[PDB]
């Protein structure tokens, strides 16, 4: 088919939230219960 | 000369009209024949 | 009336004999035998004494029809 030579040129399905950096849920829960 | 170009333009326009008209007409003929 | 209309169409168009077959060919393969007869007679009147080619070509299959 026609081509646009005019314009110069994991194995999963990742998700946006995955890259977010946060503490491990175990540590989060430990903190929550310590302050609760 | 100028009117020669005038007529050439008119021929071209009506010739394209006639061509597409004939194509559509033959399609309609095939449909009616079916 | 349908047959007479087709014959009258031929009467209208005789002056340009090559032109009528383009019309009456589509009728020639009609389900109404009266319309077929009208197409035959219209072509005949239109191209009378002309020896046109497509007119004869159209007439032939009609010359082989089940109706009388």
């Amino acid at each position: 088919d026609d081509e646009f030579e005019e314009f110069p040129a994991h194995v999963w399905e990742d998700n946006w939230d995955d890259d977010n950096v946060e503490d491990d849920f175990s540590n989060q829960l430990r903190a929550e219960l310590e302050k609760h | 000369s100028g009117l020669r170009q005038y007529y050439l333009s008119k021929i071209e326009e009506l010739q394209l009209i006639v061509n597409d008209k004939s194509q559509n007409l033959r399609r309609l003929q095939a449909q009616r024949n079916e | 009336v349908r047959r007479a209309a087709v014959e009258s169409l031929g009467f209208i168009l005789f002056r340009t004999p090559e032109q009528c077959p383009s019309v009456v060919s589509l009728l020639s393969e009609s389900y109404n035998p009266h319309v077929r007869y009208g197409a035959a007679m219209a072509l005949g009147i239109c191209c009378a004494g002309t020896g046109n080619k497509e007119a004869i070509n159209l007439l032939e299959p009609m010359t082989n029809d089940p109706v009388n």
Binding site: - | S1, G2, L3, R4, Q5, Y6, Y7, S9, K10 | -
Partner: protein, 294 residues
């Protein structure tokens, strides 16, 4: 290049009739690229035209016609092109000029065709400058040794005068006459216009140095003028010409209707041996006898 006309439109918007003309000059110079933004400012050009003008009533018309052309509203473009007047300069090779001339011809033909059938009094007036442009086109065609197709333009415009002028003043008068007769009998449909064109054709044939009496008689058959054909035959017999008269009568019988033949025979009735055998031929006795013998 320039890359922007906003400054020029600003020059136009002023109220100085000495700056305005230069602004219009530059606009006409650059319209080949900047109609895009000149379009929404056209209304300024429209109002600037619709005034005393001061050479604006001549240049703003051309500018407005150019911009409306580049847009595509030919209906509005043509009016301002006409208002421009002599600035049109029909004789020049330009695509805008070509297309505006084409649209002018189309509009004139449409108006003539639609108004010809209307009453002799209630005819919508034509634009004088439109007529002038069309006449200039006629003259260009005649000057360019393009005598053919001038009759075609005249027939489309429904003007018999120019058709007669071009068919007369041209080479191969018999050829042009034959071509015009072919067009009139074959293609064009309007019966009244056909009658007028054939009247003109017979007039030309007669005024010719050696009239084509055969074509004249065929045209007379088409017009159904038994009195005229009878006068023609009487004149032909009065002068020492008999072969032409005999052939004319034979063709008259072979083509015209029985009522027409009877009418021409009565007109003839109203040496005398020539008249008698002409009447007999018109009745067709010799024709039928010859066919039977053949």
């Amino acid at each position: 290049m320039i890359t922007s006309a906003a400054g020029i439109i600003s020059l136009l918007d002023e109220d100085e009739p000495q700056l305005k003309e230069f602004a219009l000059h530059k606009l006409n110079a650059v319209v080949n690229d900047f109609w895009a933004e000149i379009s929404e400012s056209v209304d300024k050009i429209e109002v600037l035209y619709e005034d005393e003008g001061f050479r604006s009533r001549q240049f703003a018309a051309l500018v407005a016609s150019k911009v409306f052309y580049h847009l595509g509203a030919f209906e509005e473009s043509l009016n301002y092109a006409l208002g421009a007047g002599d600035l049109f300069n029909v004789n020049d090779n330009s695509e805008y000029v070509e297309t505006i001339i084409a649209k002018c011809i189309d509009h004139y033909t449409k108006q003539c065709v639609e108004n010809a059938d209307l009453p002799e009094g209630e005819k919508k007036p034509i634009d004088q400058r439109l007529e002038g442009i069309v006449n200039k086109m006629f003259q260009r065609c005649l000057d360019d040794h393009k005598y053919k197709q001038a009759i075609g333009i005249a027939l489309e415009t429904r003007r018999l005068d120019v058709f007669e002028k071009t068919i007369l003043e041209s080479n191969d008068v018999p050829g042009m006459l034959a071509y015009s007769l072919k067009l009139c009998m074959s293609l064009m449909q309007n019966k009244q216009f056909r009658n007028k064109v054939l009247r003109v054709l017979v007039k030309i044939y007669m005024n010719l140095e050696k009239p084509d009496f055969i074509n004249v008689c065929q045209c007379l058959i088409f017009l159904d003028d038994p009195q005229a054909v009878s006068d023609i035959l009487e004149k032909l017999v009065k002068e020492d010409n008999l072969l032409m008269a005999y052939q004319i009568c034979f063709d008259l019988y072979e083509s015209a209707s029985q009522q027409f033949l009877s009418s021409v025979i009565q007109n003839l009735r109203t040496p005398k041996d020539q008249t008698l055998k002409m009447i007999k031929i018109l009745s067709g006795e010799m024709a039928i006898e010859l066919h039977l013998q053949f």
